[model samples]
Target: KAEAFLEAARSNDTEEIRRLLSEGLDPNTRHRLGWTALMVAAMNTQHNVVKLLLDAGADPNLGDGFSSVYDTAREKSLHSLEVLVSREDEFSSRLSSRASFRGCSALHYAALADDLQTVRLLLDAGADPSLKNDLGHTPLSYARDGELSAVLRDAQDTFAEAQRKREAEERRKFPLERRLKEHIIGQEGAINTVASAIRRKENGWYDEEHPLVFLFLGSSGIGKTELAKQVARYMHKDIKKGFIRMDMSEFLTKQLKQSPSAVVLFDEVEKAHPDVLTVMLQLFDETIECKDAIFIMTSNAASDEIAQHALQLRQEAQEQSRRRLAENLDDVQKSENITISNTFKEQVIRPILKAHFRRDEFLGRINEIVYFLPFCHSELLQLVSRELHYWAKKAKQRHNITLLWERPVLELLVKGYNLHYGARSIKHEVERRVVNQLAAAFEQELLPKGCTLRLTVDRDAPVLRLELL
Candidate 1:
């Protein structure tokens, strides 16, 4: 939104700029290089647009990244100091997270540039000089430089003196209110494939088949949901679109009318109501159109079983039409499909034959069946440990909370998980231990602090020791 304002400003299109603001675009959104529309105007010396942006609440000191926007502005716009400080006291709360990458605030920027006007505006507006960046650099350090040091030294001294007065203001404030974007780092492969479909190529639109459709079928924890999340994140970046996930089991028509572009996915798709699946079949066949829309479905069973029992209500329509034609046509040959191969029969069917009868279940509903073997002890240890490491990191970075696990406990659980069942058991083991245990505590911290969390695997865990947990 604020970006649109800047784009309008760049073109000197005042009507467009005003229209964007009226339409709810932020007047002060910055670009990724730590630039805002006002910054764009000032750096380009478009004085009128800069004035308009400032009037609309463009933060003179705001940048898009942690790296210094002030530093970037100093090289380009000397007039920026005059425009930003015009509304000295209002932009600080907004400036919090936007000022990052070595803590380069408006004060640090002014001090470094040896510009008294800019320094004074920030000081009058109540900008902090002592705040630290990721590398811990501060505005005061820039003030201590060698030449034209007086300009910096004075700003530094005034900022120093003002610190005592500003503490009440500073303490009353929570500095660096950065909007941590939805950090999505899981299911790397799924993300890449979806992104490949959207990226434009020199030849034409990337993989343009007039909308893309994919159906992922697997057990609950084998990354079906995770794959959907990853795809959403990818489209958010690729198309500048927002993601909407629909659990097929919970969906009703109440939310269907609105267009959801940023990667809509149906999780545990087979659980969808027959009515819902019937409605979705039109969606799956790509008969519907919505801007920036893509659909992915994950199911627990084969497409054939679900296809036969669930959807195909439209197929029923075709069947009635086919009955009429059947009377007029010749005989058709029956089709047959092999459900299980010899290898799976030897590995899985023979052992389970004594306990259960899957042959009846698989006769025609499933084909090309993939067997899930019980993981070895070494494999279980590595898998559980990986899930643990992921949640533990999420705890620390997001909620300012932390957790650690002793190896003895991890070993006990991993062994039990391995002896328990097949691949699905790994998920059960992780959910009970890591998810159930950590969820409440983690959510408690997140609710209050408004922090972001991320799950991570321990990259340093040696494979041999990792497998051994």
Candidate 2:
């Protein structure tokens, strides 16, 4: 009967063992070899059966020839050792017998078993990690020369910190591309693509072996380089730090060694010598270091195509308006914009791919090829307004001069604006016409503190006239 009971307990037959126990079999009944039902259940690592047998009034303090169930569990470094030790009324004291853990506590046997997890569990449950064995080696000493020594060294605080960092990083809308869109105007498509890539990485679906590679194609003075800097700030919280920038001419001068968390930008990739393109291909093919970094490469290969397309659309609009066949010029312009939007990728990117000295292999590895279009006149106006405010403050602080301009002055500024030159042209125009005139006034000693240099047009000459106020 006892042998049949031990077999039932060993196989985790909870119902069968419970029926046998109710039919006058003792919970502590031992087999011929002196192993009890709990001991057999624990020896087989039957977690459910061990708990069931314990609840049936089994005596955990009973021992086999060498040790008890607690000692057996400790030796195996099983997590159920905690379940057994927890059952004793006086846990550490009663397990103090000669056969119990060979006269050491649960932690001692767990340490001897070299089980980091079990040692952590015992320590968490308030077992003394300082308990010594016959060799006078404590649990700390037991882990000293083993593979799990590091786990024992900082297991308590390290695990907690690791979990906290993991949760904090994955929970928020990470990389925060919305924040990028706020300052960077009129590149919604590029912003959305970068945002999606960052989302995939945070959610654990992105390929980790290859970095997040992007190719930005556009004209100068557009937001291509600015967006990369924003991403660096979002990931590393720094603009001056963790951002690695290099021109294409420096391709083989020195290879960029970056951290796994860096953002790297390669400016004017198409202007690179043909040999540099080959070098870039080789570097990406064998590049394994800093695989987690984000890479952005700007190309002007599509600039001519985009500019020509814009110019063609404008010419077609002007020709159509000269006929006055259409009721509205607004519809004519809007129609061209929609047509350009529909055919931009098919017409622009494919042609650039054919002409540029690049491999499809390099292109194939990229996550996204974002095309930045030329800025509109209205966007340039916003840029000019912001620049004017900044310049006014700077002039007030440095030169003690207050300059004010009218809508005619702004109209004069907008008249010479070129789509090819983008916002950079506006900056140069402001510095030449406004700042130069101000400096001339200072040199001629015709300025006073808080003097307003009001802007008006010399209509006969079509030039700017600054009136001192």
Candidate 3:
């Protein structure tokens, strides 16, 4: 009866096999060749009979005579193959003849089988067809015939698609100008140039061989370092993560270990060692071999010279006002504005660059030499407001207080602004007046949470008054 049952399963006799199984024949009983009734049915491509045995509690994981039931199904029956493959225990079994070839399992074995259908079914079951064998040959090299080429090709395409997905996810997490505009003020050309470069690089549209390189020429406290910090934070989460701020005055350097993307700032670049500057240029040349990096340089190069020229221009304007003597001083102001507008860039800024970094090759590689202009009176007031708003946010978090101010408060900050000193004077004034008063109020317990404090200046007293509202 058991012999009859095995013969019936191998012959694809579904009804007879069902009858024998119902008549108390063990579903898991092995045949003469060490094959189970289930294996016989699957080996014969009798998918319906295989399904019946599986439903009746047949173990698909049982070993056959030479190969496991799964490996035999792959060799013999396409129609019953998926049924066995879906059972992960059989699919993962490493049963094979050659000791060295025991490594080929699932799609790895299928691709070398040179049977296109077997490769397709294994792949559809989530097999990585490009897997390597013990001999270090990829499934492509193991392809016994050209017929299985698509299997390895499909695996290669999957890898690129996954990498593209991760690149897109990174861009979505930290956006450009949207986050930058919260802190940076008014350098649209500078902001737009870098923002576009970053977007292009993230999208994989830029040349991977050359990194984004920049030269920042500016007066002190003019947002050069601030821009670099924002860019580093955008790429690396923290402004200091993978950040290298080499003060050019110091003449030393460092390298990267983990991060794939990084920012390097060369501050006071006119003072940089020539050897140090060459090392930076060498990085640009070998960027294809190095990790993706952004390089920025700040120069106070001819800053003294530029300031002196500006001061002379201002003095000339003042002398004109004295000479004309009540004949519309606006003419003197307009003359200085014309000179600053028309010639200061070509005559003043250009000479500074030409004198310091005269190498055409060195200058040619830089994408942009962004100039941070001396902070204007209006911009100084705006920075003051930004600084105070930051302080207000901290106060709200710490003391549960609100800070309020009006147009006059802005004018008072503007009055302390100086072009040569940039925003430093305004910083000193705020520290001495507003911050000192806030500390006193907090210590004395004169101010409570959930209340407003307004800032104002009096004409007669020339002092800042903190009013509770």
Candidate 4:
């Protein structure tokens, strides 16, 4: 039956081809020679048969080890070639791959034959002229005619320019520093250090012997994990399970032998066993040749001391602002940015990390020691607002209810803020006070459907009051 179908196509007997197709013969069935019905019809310049097979869903991209249907058509019949190129919309999706076949694509054949019309037709239908054959000859290289060579060169230039623009557009959309700053609030110094290190790795300026290593030292919930998550998100855009997060307390040995480009986070590295740390020492000192991997180790060991230093730095900035009689509050606020100098790391942070791990070499290998500062009062307020906004969006999306809150509600929520607990404490407070009330109200059928729920702090009672409007 496959032989009959090929014979009907080869003989230009559209009626017999139509009958076989109606009998549910696979349109893509190949002959013993690897040629499909479409290729045979195309080889004989059977224009009507080519159109019938194509309309019956015959794949035009099928090759016979040497030439494709388009290659055969371009070599023999411009009439059959026009039929294939006229269905440009249908073939557009597969045209690029069709022109990417190993030995010789259709465009390569057209260029070799010096068929300018066929070349233009293939290029117009999304054929990649820049694709190289198995012999490393592009379509442009095969063109003997000067005009055909010019056309192929123009197509290659256009394709290269489009590719460059696409990569530039992707880089512009996913700006690492801006994205990190938007999510991880109040950690500008840490953000800067992490972003710079990642940029160096991305631009290929780092040592090939070691992977990108970062030591994130700070209080819990102060964006160490969040920063790591953001980095993973930026690096691996299509991955749903963003990065490999291993709790070092569990004490497991791991390696990135399979996926060298993976992002790995070691949570609470201070809690890991001596054996695990020893393994990590080898990993950091080039046991694993993971030149493309990113390793982030977070610790709460020197958090207290870090917080103390940040406080003294903030106080000194305040004292300096007072002495200078700086009228602009922004200047004083900007001065609060703690500069994490190498001297400070050696003097303050290294001693604490060395005491915990007892290894100067291990601490020295870290690319960046990013300190997560405790949130100031204003930053805590920002966290509260962000949390409330998140809940508000949820309410509107899930319940079709509009959530509104007064400024006092935010101020009241900030009262529950704990410097040591960071944003985690604020999140819990919002859940306890705001979400708890809303949930109970919703259960009791108190919240009106599609109604605006205004949250306010009752001055007399000092509690959250929800009123629907």
TM-score of each: 0.31, 0.51, 0.51, 0.56
Model 1 lDDT tens row, 1-469: 3555656665566788778878878776655344456544543345566556666766655532424446544644646564244222212213333354433444455455455554544544444555554556665665645543564456557767765655544323311110111232222223323333344321365444335555554335545454456555544654334556777667543343454455666776545666675566555444244544666666555333323332222233234323322222242221112212343345544344323323343222221222212233555566667767776677567665545555655665665454324444655766774576456544564333434333333435312111101
Residue 30 accuracy (lDDT) in model 2: 71
Could you tell me how far off, in angstroms, the CA of residue 26 lies in candidate 4 after the best superposition?
90
What TM-score would candidate 1 get against the native?
A: 0.31
Worst 10 residues of 3 by lDDT: 86-95
Candidate 4 lDDT score at position 232: 84
Q: Which model is ahead, 2 or 4, in terms of lDDT?
A: 4
Worst 10 residues of 4 by lDDT: 87-96
Once fitted onto the true fold, the runs of candidate 1 whose alpha carbons sit more than 4 angstroms away are: 1-209, 237-241, 247-259, 271-278, 284-289, 302-383, 390-411, 418-469
Which consecutive 10 residues in model 1 have the weakest lDDT in total?
Answer: 174-183
As for candidate 2, its clashing pairs are: none
* Deviation of model 1 at 383, angstroms: 4.4
Task: Give the alpha carbon lDDT tens digit for every residue of 382-408 in model 2.
Answer: 666666767788878877777777667
Per-model lDDT: 0.47, 0.63, 0.64, 0.71
Backbone clashes in model 4, listed as residue pairs:
none
C-alpha lDDT of candidate 3 relative to the true structure: 0.64
Please report, as a residue range, the 10-residue window in candidate 2 with the lowest summed lDDT.
87-96
lDDT of 1: 0.47
Residue 106 error, candidate 2, Å? 79
